[PDB]
């Protein structure tokens, strides 16, 4: 139902206001203004859903907030039909926190089999306040008021990065376009609502490992963006007695008029003394959880709360859990084997950072953006926290034995690899193995999210325009040989990493492990004996799902599919492996197991005796190491032939 | 001109919006690159730097560029040939000037023009309610307004409590937030600085540097009395600028342009302000060297003029010589300093260092904190730490002065008796002699003169804002004196208040009390006939007051804060009375000299060989030391007779 989709709209307005605008029939009303009557029978089913007060965000990492979303979605998910779901939504909407309501709805599309996440509205069209700076939203309300007066039905407002921080004095602001990318922040929301740590254990396959894998890829790609910008790779925030050097001022205000808290430079990670105090958590508490978890990783087993020991291995027996998954569930934490011993490090860390401006709650303040999944990626400290988290996972990966020859062997030989950018501008054909990136404006209709009307009959639409990194489509072709006498199935596994570090030194195999990111991992049609060519288009990538919002549901943003690269051209490894055998691979499918038994990111998450990626690949005929150049264009038209006039004369052959 | 007063209204709206609402005839209009007044080139050429301050930021009173802009705009207003022309100029420039700069210039104009009276200016909270009322409350008002209009309701009242801006149970400084955030006190601060701006043409005020000292000394002293009433320790100067400011402050204020005031976390360093542009920066060690230079001048008894000559510092001046306290004040503020290059601009810049300490290198595109503006700075607990430092500099200077000689303290009139009596305020209770009370009472004002709450033009909506204030009953005092001479004698009575005991319960000696004395009433009497006379003064006549939520207009110590809070059990205060031989006193009069040649606060700002105030007063028949008790009532009706039936028995005589 596009009737269902309407429930996402105008989340800060009453159900009556939404219903009036949309011609939705309402259940009985009463005065709390006009508010729906909440049937006692429905209320009895709602668990803790109503316990979260209106006027604050959904704090996804907080136990009480997550339980409320889980409790509300439970009713939505268990509704006997979509018509009944629609009725329950309409009835409860006036009585639940709006962000909790929205989170529960999105989660419901992932959990219900008769709903598709691709049919949910793009998050920025629903909660534009989460992605657009305070001053721009305020400027839009102004422009709307004037437009209505002068009988203008449309207005467009826009902004630029030059307006939320000063790059010339703040190196971290150089990558704010990427951290603040509305599609990336929405992807983060989708990931956590598709794979919430509070999910009933068993209803996901390898969710702890997927937590590791998606965030590993998120951190790796961030670093590629940093290298593209002449920044040093992100440093883990691991010594928690050192103040967080780089603060962050989000410049965001919620639809309830609540401006998000900021964090000054040089703020300490401090004990959170909650209200009530008995709900508090402490830095040395998190440190001891970390100590316990490091011990378990180092000795190769966790202790179950039931007293038994659980082996950690990424070479499991049939029916045994993967060690990476067990560590992930313990670290997030989700379905931990022992909450009392290993704790809740990653989630609470978000809340410590998000409350660090007022950790003893003396000043009656809001949380910072680290406290919410749809905003946390904006903050540079997100990536310092996740580099720490990825370090824990890599610590575990290093305890695993290298893949054996048999574990890496394959029947298919990889013979060649070529990458070709598609046509994107007249009179230019990209040389082979060269990819480009550039900035392009995108515009969306914010009136689905914010009611800009002064009075009922006003006809006003506010469009919001801003710049996004983007790239032309590209394809690649893998040439393989099947030397056997029968048809062979294979999975192609393709990963990207920069060739050089920030010092210009070639990264060895060990260092590259921290960088490999998924380009495309998929099964081919059966390969006939002999030579075959397999061609994939960038829009088909395993990391994508299926107008400012190209891909819907849970998807790595298509516009951030290619790292920025540099004006001179930046060199990347393009690793290809042929191995014997519609949702984003980063997101998984709620109702299906991970098909592939190999660990996520295989084979490039384990140590090797080989010193270089070159030496590693040379050992295996089913692996090939290709190379591409990625070039950022400040002015895309620069690729065009310039006249003989205006042509530049070079001092040293090239200029 | 009540048409003049209208210019203060709806400061965030266009001139067209104001004129339309008020039926003001407009000059020619045009469309800016909406309807805006045409600004005559002839007027523009007269405006100096007034137009250089962009719309959308506050007036930053301590900043030299902002103050110059207010001075430049007010100049045109003040020099206008008539009030009709003044109104014309105001109407014409309103669309083209920063609104806070506009308002400041207008208030200053009432002080500076002889045909205008500051008492006729609107109360500041009715003009800029956003400066005094929390963000959440203004936003709640907008919501209540929208609903009211829809339901044909022409009036709405919103209110709030201190429990909503900080948590007293975890933040001792919040216990005195009611006083620091008192809207009348903050308005008084605005008035003081616009009546006595440091940028005034030198000579157009008498002893302005000394008045800067004196008003702030009284402001700090009264704050300390409020702290003692609340079982808080007296305020500590912020003097070692290497130490982070322990107590932060989150103002919870948002301007009418939607710009939320910056906050300051606990434990924030006082840091170099690297301005944009960088050449406009100032540095902590720079301020420290100005301080070193000033301490030196104070200690050796002279300042060095920028012309190379030395200027003696003395509070015993020759006729025609400046007062040392005045010279120090002008150097410290700074205002008409003898040597800007040597003594600097310590006090003003310190406000800006503190106000920008959340982002001192301007990396994060942020706004200033409340310390940057005169109408908000008093809210911040650090205001009083900064002013305790400032008062310490002034006291350092006062201590270099020789004690008053017998001749300087002698008088013809003898003080025989002193009595204080609270007026009637509740039926069936008469206050015992020498007992004063305080309690909290609500006050309400109409905010619709400041904020346009209309959705569309024809809406009839008024938003009242209600909140609690400290208050006290009227009181009077009577001084019994004797004139033992043979002719009529005129005298000035000088009455000061200070607590008797410090925070440790120890009797404060003479030296300690110097830091506490605050003006109660200083005034000249009618000539006193030979023999005995009784002089009775009502509290509403006090010299510290000027002449409905806003009792006294123009520049006045708040009547509601005239009496320190006191305690539930009753707190004891010295009430010092001196008879000396011959429009708030804190504000002075713009056009007239200080009539009294004695230093402000005489004789209780100099050292004495006498150890106690008792010993000091006993030496002089024209001085008497009285004592009063001040008792705060949580519930004012508690003073009433209770039913014999309901009285509870005490274990230890009293309970
Ligand atoms: C911008 O977005 C909103 C989507 O909510 C559109 O508003 C709808 O417009 C249709 C056609 O006028 C109305 O029938 C609906 O009642 C509107 N929905 C709501 C909730 O207001 C709007 O049309 C879009 N504007 C443009 C230019 O496409
Ligand atoms: C609240 O304050 C405003 C003063 O600004 C009053 O609004 C005026 O009301 C009169 C009478 O209706 C109008 O003619 C004026 O045009 C209004 N002025 C403005 C600027 O709107 C309002 O009346 C006050 N409300 C009460 C109850 O006193
Ligand atoms: C409002 O404006 C839109 C776009 O400007 C126009 O297409 C439409 O006819 C109007 N809608 C209504 C209901 O008046
Ligand atoms: C603890 O739980 C695990 C579940 O896998 C089980 O295998 C083990 O037997 C349990 N320990 C005991 C002694 O119950
Ligand atoms: C190749 O295919 C055979 C037959 O399916 C399979 O059993 C074996 O695992 C593969 N061998 C190699 C060389 O990896
Ligand atoms: C791979 O393909 C590229 C271009 O299509 C070509 O330069 C190269 O010769 C090929 N290598 C092999 C082994 O076919
Ligand atoms: C790839 O996706 C983008 C956005 O959806 C689209 O512009 C482009 O045409 C797509 N390419 C193809 C051939 O589908
Ligand atoms: C607005 O409402 C008030 C009462 O709240 C009323 O006195 C006044 O007449 C109204 N204004 C108009 C123009 O009707
Ligand atoms: C410097 O200024 C003072 C101010 O009174 C004046 O008396 C003195 O003559 C000046 N010094 C010189 C040398 O000009
Ligand atoms: C007392 O009055 C006389 C006459 O005016 C005056 O000279 C003297 O200064 C006054 N004060 C004292 C203490 O003598
Ligand atoms: C002062 O006045 C009070 C009350 O009016 C009286 O009781 C006391 O005796 C007086 N003292 C003198 C010295 O007159
Ligand atoms: C003193 O001022 C207050 C506030 O304006 C007023 O309520 C009281 O009546 C005044 N007292 C007298 C007697 O003027
Ligand atoms: O989890 Cu995805 O934000 Cu730390
Ligand atoms: O000066 Cu009155 O605010 Cu420091
Ligand atoms: Cl149901
Ligand atoms: Cl942008
Ligand atoms: Cl701590
Ligand atoms: Cl508590
Ligand atoms: Cl600069
Ligand atoms: Mg100090
Ligand atoms: Na909110």
UniProtKB/TrEMBL annotation, chain B:
Residues in Tyrosinase copper-binding domain copies: 380-391
GO molecular function: metal ion binding; oxidoreductase activity
Gene Ontology cellular-component terms listed: extracellular region
Superkingdom field: Eukaryota
Gene3D superfamilies linked to this entry: Di-copper center containing domain from catechol oxidase (1.10.1280.10), Hemocyanin, C-terminal domain (2.60.40.1520), Hemocyanin, N-terminal domain (1.20.1370.10)
Location of the protein in the cell: Secreted
Keyword field: Copper, Disulfide bond, Metal-binding, Secreted, Signal
Pfam families: Hemocyanin_C (PF03723), Hemocyanin_M (PF00372), Hemocyanin_N (PF03722)
Glycan-linked positions: 307, 412, 417, 460, 540
Official protein name in the record: Prophenoloxidase b
Matching PROSITE patterns: HEMOCYANIN_1, HEMOCYANIN_2, TYROSINASE_2
InterPro entries reported in the protein's UniProt record: Di-copper_centre_dom_sf, Hemocyanin/hexamerin, Hemocyanin/hexamerin_mid_dom, Hemocyanin_C, Hemocyanin_C_sf, Hemocyanin_N, Hemocyanin_N_sf, Ig_E-set
Covalent S-S links between cysteines: 555-587, 650-655
């Amino acid at each position: 139902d596009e009737e269902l989709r309407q429930l996402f709209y105008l989340p800060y307005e009453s159900t009556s206001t939404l219903a009036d605008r949309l011609g939705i029939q309402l259940p009985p009303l009463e005065l709390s203004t006009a508010v729906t009557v909440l049937d006692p029978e429905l209320k009895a089913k709602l668990g803790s859903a109503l316990s979260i007060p209106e006027g604050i965000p959904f704090f996804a990492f907080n136990k009480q907030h997550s339980q409320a979303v889980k409790d509300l979605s439970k009713v939505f998910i268990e509704a006997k039909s979509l018509n009944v779901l629609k009725d329950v939504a309409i009835m409860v909407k006036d009585h639940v926190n709006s962000a909790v309501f929205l989170a529960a709805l999105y989660h419901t599309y992932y959990e219900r089999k008769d709903l598709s996440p691709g049919d949910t509205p793009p998050l920025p069209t629903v909660l534009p306040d989460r992605f657009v700076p305070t001053f721009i939203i305020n400027k839009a309300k102004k422009l709307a008021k004037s437009a209505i007066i002068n009988n203008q039905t449309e207005v467009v407002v826009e902004w630029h990065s030059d307006e939320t921080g000063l790059s010339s004095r703040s190196p971290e602001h150089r990558v704010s376009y990427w951290r603040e990318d509305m599609n990336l922040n929405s992807f983060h929301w989708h990931w956590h609502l598709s794979n919430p740590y509070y999910i009933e254990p068993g209803d996901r396959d390898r969710r702890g490992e997927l937590f590791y894998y998606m965030h590993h890829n998120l951190v790796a790609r961030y670093n590629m963006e940093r290298l593209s910008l002449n920044l040093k790779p992100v440093k883990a925030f691991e010594d928690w007695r050192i103040p967080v050097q780089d603060g962050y001022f989000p410049h965001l205000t919620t639809g309830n008029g609540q401006e998000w808290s900021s964090r000054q430079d040089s703020t300490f990670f401090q004990d959170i003394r909650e209200i009530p105090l008995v709900d508090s958590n402490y830095v040395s508490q998190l440190e001891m959880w970390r100590t316990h978890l490091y011990h378990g990783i180092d000795v190769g087993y966790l202790i179950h709360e039931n007293g038994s020991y659980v082996r950690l291995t990424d070479n499991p027996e049939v029916g045994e859990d993967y060690g990476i998954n067990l560590v992930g569930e313990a670290l997030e934490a989700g379905d931990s084997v022992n909450p009392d011993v290993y704790g809740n490090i990653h989630n609470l860390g978000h809340d410590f950072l998000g409350q660090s401006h007022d950790p003893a709650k003396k000043h009656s303040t809001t949380s910072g953006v680290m406290g919410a999944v749809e905003t946390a990626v904006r903050d540079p400290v997100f990536f310092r926290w996740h580099k720490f988290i990825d370090n824990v996972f890599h610590r575990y990966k290093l305890t695993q034995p290298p893949y054996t020859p048999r574990q890496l062997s394959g029947n298919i030989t990889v013979l060649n690899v070529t990458v070709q950018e598609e046509h994107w501008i007249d009179d230019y054909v990209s040389p082979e193995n060269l990819l480009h990136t550039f900035f392009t404006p995108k515009t969306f209709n914010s009136s689905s999210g914010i009611d800009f009307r002064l009075k009922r009959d006003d006809n006003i639409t506010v469009h919001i325009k801003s710049n996004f990194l983007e790239h032309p489509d590209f394809s690649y072709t893998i040439t393989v040989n099947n030397p056997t006498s029968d048809f062979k199935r294979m999975k192609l596994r393709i990963f990207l990493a920069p060739k050089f570090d920030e010092e210009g030194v070639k990264m060895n195999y060990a260092s590259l492990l921290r960088y490999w990111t998924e380009v495309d991992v998929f099964e081919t049609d059966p390969i006939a004996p002999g030579i075959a060519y397999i061609t994939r288009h960038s829009n088909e990538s395993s990391i994508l799902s299926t107008t400012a919002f190209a891909f819907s549901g849970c998807s790595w943003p298509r516009n951030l599919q290619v790292p920025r690269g540099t004006q001179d051209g930046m060199n990347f490894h393009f690793f290809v492996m042929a191995t014997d055998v519609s949702s984003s691979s980063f997101c998984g499918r709620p109702d299906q197991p991970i098909p592939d038994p190999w660990p996520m990111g295989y084979p490039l998450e384990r140590r090797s005796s080989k010193a270089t990626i070159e030496d590693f690949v040379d050992e295996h005929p089913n692996m090939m190491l290709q190379e591409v150049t990625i070039t950022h264009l400040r002015d895309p038209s620069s690729v065009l032939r310039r006249p003989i006039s205006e042509r530049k004369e070079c001092l040293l052959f090239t200029c």
